[PDB]
Design a protein around this ligand. Structure first.
Ligand code: PLX
Ligand code: 3PE
Lengths: 121, 174
């Protein structure tokens, strides 16, 4: 468990207060569109299993499938983005705090670096 | 013809001997050349005059792209991806230009062989040495880089050559 038990973590909180400072996903996010596509596929499979006309029947039901998937996908994307932002924040802070462990190395050009040449023949 | 550069693609002056006939018999080659000029050369020249007249009314120009020099892989720092990319592209363009230079020298060699004919072994000695020098330099540069050649690999090859030459010079001066 890497980030479980990180200080200041409220248990059973899907989205903390500090996540509000991040850009929310655009409603036309390709990931949101894919969640809607999953909802549509679920609706078609429902019609097929129940032996209704696949594309025509149950338009209200198919709409509910798509809407539920888009809703949950929006909140899932927010939580995923928050966790990744948290990971990057922690990593940058640790690198800043441990300079002796993450030292800046002098850059040498390829005119100074010597590399063995392996001919292909 | 002003189509190409006579310095890049040289040809010796053409010495054509004057005819010196010694027979009363007519020359079938001359008669057939006259027939060819009457039946073929005149119609094709008229057609080209018409086409060239049509071209001159719609004159337009195209230009030769100019590339400025950028820092090379020797100056690029290690794992500096942008400078490495620019240097690699520049090296690739220079590789293409060198290939075409070798092609030009080979064209010179072939044309001289055919032109000289039965005395090519002596009359094409200048072109043979030039081809030898150009091909040797091209081979030493890009000889065994492989299918996945790169400016870094060529730099490593040149560094190896420089080390070998320095060692040989030290041993000679010893
Ligand atoms: C009507 C609209 C549609 C609703 C449909 C609902 C269906 C899903 C139901 C909701 C499930 C999540 C519940 C949300 C409220 C609970 C809040 C809490 O549970 O969230 C966090 C925890 O929530 C879950 O752990 C994460 C929820 C996300 C799971 C769904 C995505 C799974 C990834 C699958 C990726 C590929 C599929 C993509 C989705 C299609 C709390 O963290 P914590 O209390 O400290 O956990 C302790 C244990 N640990 C540390 C070891 C983890
Ligand atoms: C009938 C069968 C079920 C399908 C129902 C589909 C309903 C879609 C419309 C939802 C309501 C419209 C709405 O609220 O639109 C607002 C918003 C527009 O996006 P917005 O960010 O405002 O735009 C700015 C940049 N263009 O809208 C959005 O951002 C919505 C985009 C999120 C993803 C939605 C689902 C994507 C499509 C999945 C397949 C469903 C459609 C299949 C159709 C088959 C027809 C035979």
């Amino acid at each position: 468990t890497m980030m479980s038990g990180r200080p200041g973590r409220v248990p059973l909180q899907f989205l903390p207060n500090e996540a509000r400072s991040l850009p929310p996903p655009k409603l036309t996010d390709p990931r949101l569109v894919y969640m809607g596509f999953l909802g549509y596929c679920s609706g078609l499979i429902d019609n097929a299993i129940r032996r209704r006309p696949v594309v025509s029947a149950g338009l209200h039901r198919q709409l509910l499938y798509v809407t539920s998937f888009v809703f949950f996908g929006y909140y899932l994307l927010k939580r995923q983005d928050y966790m990744y932002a948290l990971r990057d924040h922690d990593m940058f802070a640790y690198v800043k705090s441990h300079p002796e462990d993450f030292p800046e190395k002098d850059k040498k050009t390829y005119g100074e670096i010597l590399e063995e040449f392996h001919p292909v023949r | 013809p002003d189509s190409w550069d006579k310095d890049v693609y040289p040809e010796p002056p053409r010495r054509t001997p004057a005819p010196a006939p010694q027979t009363s018999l007519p020359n079938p080659v001359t008669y057939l050349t006259k027939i060819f000029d009457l039946l073929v050369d005149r119609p094709v020249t008229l057609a080209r005059e018409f086409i060239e007249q049509q071209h001159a009314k719609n004159r337009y120009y195209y230009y030769h792209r100019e590339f400025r020099r950028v820092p090379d892989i020797t100056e690029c720092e290690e794992k500096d991806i942008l400078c490495m990319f620019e240097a690699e592209m520049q090296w690739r363009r220079d590789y293409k230009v060198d290939q075409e230079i070798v092609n030009i020298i080979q064209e010179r060699l072939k044309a001289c062989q055919q032109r000289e004919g039965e005395s090519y072994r002596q009359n094409c000695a200048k072109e043979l040495e030039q081809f030898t020098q150009v091909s040797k330099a091209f081979q030493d540069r890009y000889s065994d880089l492989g299918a996945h050649y790169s400016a870094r690999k060529c730099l490593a090859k040149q560094k190896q050559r420089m080390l070998a030459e320095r060692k040989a010079a030290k041993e000679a001066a010893a």
